[PDB]
Amino acid sequence: RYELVKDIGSGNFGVARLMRDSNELVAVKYIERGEKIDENVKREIINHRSLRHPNIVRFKEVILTPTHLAIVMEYASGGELFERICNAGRFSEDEARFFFQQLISGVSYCHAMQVCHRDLKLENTLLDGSAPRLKICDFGYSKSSVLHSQPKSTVGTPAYIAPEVLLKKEYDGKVADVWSCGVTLYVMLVGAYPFEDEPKNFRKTIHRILNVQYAIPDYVHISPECRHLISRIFVADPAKRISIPEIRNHEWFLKNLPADLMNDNTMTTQFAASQSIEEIMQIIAEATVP
Amino acid sequence: SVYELDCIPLWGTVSIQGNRSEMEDAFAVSPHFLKLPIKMLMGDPSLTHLTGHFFGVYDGHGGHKVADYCRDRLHFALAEEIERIKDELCKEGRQVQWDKVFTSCFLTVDGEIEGKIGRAVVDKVLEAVASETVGSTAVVALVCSSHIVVSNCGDSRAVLFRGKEAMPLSVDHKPDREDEYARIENAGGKVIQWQGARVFGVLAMSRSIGDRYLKPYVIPEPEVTFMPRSREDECLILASDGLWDVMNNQEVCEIARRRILMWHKKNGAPPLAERGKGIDPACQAAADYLSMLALQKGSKDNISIIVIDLKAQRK
Ligand SMILES: [Mg+2]
Ligand SMILES: [Mg+2]
């Protein structure tokens, strides 16, 4: 059983109740029990349950209550990465590298599990105290999510939008995700989103994105290999943009790369970190009753 | 019979900052504000004009200047257009007339905001009101004895409760809405899917006031609806998305009706002398309640709600 602690805000503009077990913190999302418990909600849970990468926010369990169906998720006790960088400064090239390796390991895994682009929402990066680990891909993140969402009238972090998302009508989603990773790397190193600055002037930000007009300021001193990786990622033409496997073989990435993050197959990740499907199915059944 | 006696405006309002860093919502309620030539409501029982009570919600984005400007100006702009359309006192149903007057009003304000139409300042200067990326929604309702007129632009909406079935009087201008999507794309603009359907990946609406930078894809042309009042009418609710994001039409109306009746049953209707000279406490009750309900349902946006009682008397 768990004990109420707070009501924090979720990842993609959502709501959750922070609770506590073990001395472990958990994030619990809820969903109106009145037969909102379709087939969309079942597949989406079982899907997310199959995602076992340590840098993915992972499904813990599902509890039935008189009010709703409770979705217990793993909690990111470090919070949002950007809000971190703000009240702590830009990270060093070595701290940035640590986390970037984790991201790529995670993105790579998600891509392999068929999860990407708007299903993965890389604008949302979280941190957790329990390596440090950066954590992506929370429950209410898919395009077809049954989880309630309340996005703003204006888009939050447009820098994450790859130019081909604005420019073309057909493009690879996994490759658009590379650009996003670039954005996450830049913010870690500089302490500010790249193509943006007066902020919230979308005209200027979009202008800079489309012309890939960024500038690493002088107060930030980073190696030439790092600047190269960034220049290889921030290219408007998807076809000339560096790929994930290519990133995995780049010098900057390879330096101080731990052994476990040298994982090819997706099935050794699953065994690496190791509630039953019958339990989940039994509870979603009892959940259709208001 | 309805065209020979003005109605008493019964209303209550909430407009709060909620969990946001700024308040960019604004509203305006101007009862007894304008006199409506009867031919604009009736046709072709004398009373040459009906008193029209103005209600407005303006949900701003990118800043507060444009929502605030609507608050201070729009009703006056609307008044001017009503006067202009007494050059029709010479020369075309009611719908077309209202649609026409409301389009010119919303367009005038838009122009004043971008500094292409002359406006008053503390002699009639051309000065922009705000940056090119700041804008606002606008939903307004004219209530008189005979008719309700709603003119909507953006994702705030107005909902009428008629008997037992909720019926909205505006449809949200979201970029993935069929005609809207089409209009944009066919015009040469782009709607992307990113944290919802967005014009060019940025703005979660297809219509608004301001937002120069997304012209002429994001337009200030409103969608006016002309609704004759009925004896079954219970109430009218205008609100920003702060409310509609967490609650459906039907439940909002029902809750609002309950609380109105709840206050009347546990306090009885006040004397005619007080009525319409300020906020009706039963409406204020409903407004206040819906407001806190939204906050508990998890709404993190600015919240603005105007509840308007449409019932002659409740016994
Ligand atoms: Mg607002
Ligand atoms: Mg709002």
UniProtKB/Swiss-Prot annotation, chain A:
Reported consequences of knocking out the gene: Impaired ozone-triggered rapid transient decrease (RTD) in stomatal conductance. Impaired induction of MKKK18 activity after 90 minutes of abscisic acid (ABA) treatment. Delayed CO(2)-mediated and darkness-induced and reduced abscisic acid (ABA)-triggered stomatal closure.
UniProt-annotated stretches for the region Domain I: 259-290
Signal peptide interval: none
Location of Phosphoserine modifications: 10, 22, 153
Active site annotation, chain numbering: 119
Tissue expression pattern: Expressed in seedlings, leaves, flowers, stems, and roots, but restricted to guard cells and vascular tissue.
A GO term, aspect molecular function: identical protein binding
UniProt note on regulation of activity: Kinase activity enhanced by ABA and low humidity. Repressed by PP2CA independently of its phosphatase activity. Probably inactivated by ABI1. Repressed by TOPP1. Negatively regulated by ABI2.
Result when mutating residue 14 to R: In ost1-2; loss of kinase activity, and insensitivity to ABA during the stomatal aperture regulation
GO CC terms, sorted: cytoplasm; nucleus; plasma membrane
Region (Activation loop): 138-164
EC number(s) per entry: 2.7.11.1
Any Gene Ontology biological process: sucrose metabolic process
Similarity remark: Belongs to the protein kinase superfamily. Ser/Thr protein kinase family.
Protein name, per record: Serine/threonine-protein kinase SRK2E
Residues of the full protein shown: 20 to 318 of 362
Curated annotation (Swiss-Prot), chain B:
Binding site for Mn(2+) 2: 59, 241, 301
Known regulation of activity: Repressed by PYR/PYL/RCAR ABA receptors in an ABA-dependent manner.
Site (Lock): 194
Transmembrane segments: none
Induction section of the entry: Repressed by MYB44. Induced by ABA.
Primary location group: cytoplasm
Subcellular location: Cytoplasm; Nucleus
GO cellular component: cytoplasm; nucleus
Biological process annotations from GO: abscisic acid-activated signaling pathway
Role summary: Key component and repressor of the abscisic acid (ABA) signaling pathway that regulates numerous ABA responses, such as stomatal closure, seed germination and inhibition of vegetative growth. Confers enhanced sensitivity to drought.
Domain writeup: The 'lock' site stabilizes the complex made of PP2C, ABA and PYR/PYL/RCAR receptor by keeping receptor 'gate' and 'latch' loops in closed positions.
The protein's assembly and partners: Interacts with SWI3B (via N-terminus). Interacts with ABA-bounded PYR1, PYL1, PYL2, PYL3, PYL4, PYL5, PYL6, PYL8 and PYL9, and with free PYL2, PYL3, PYL4, PYL10 and PYL13.
Protein's UniProt name: Protein phosphatase 2C 16
Protein's organism: Arabidopsis thaliana (Mouse-ear cress)
Residues of the full protein shown: 180 to 506 of 511
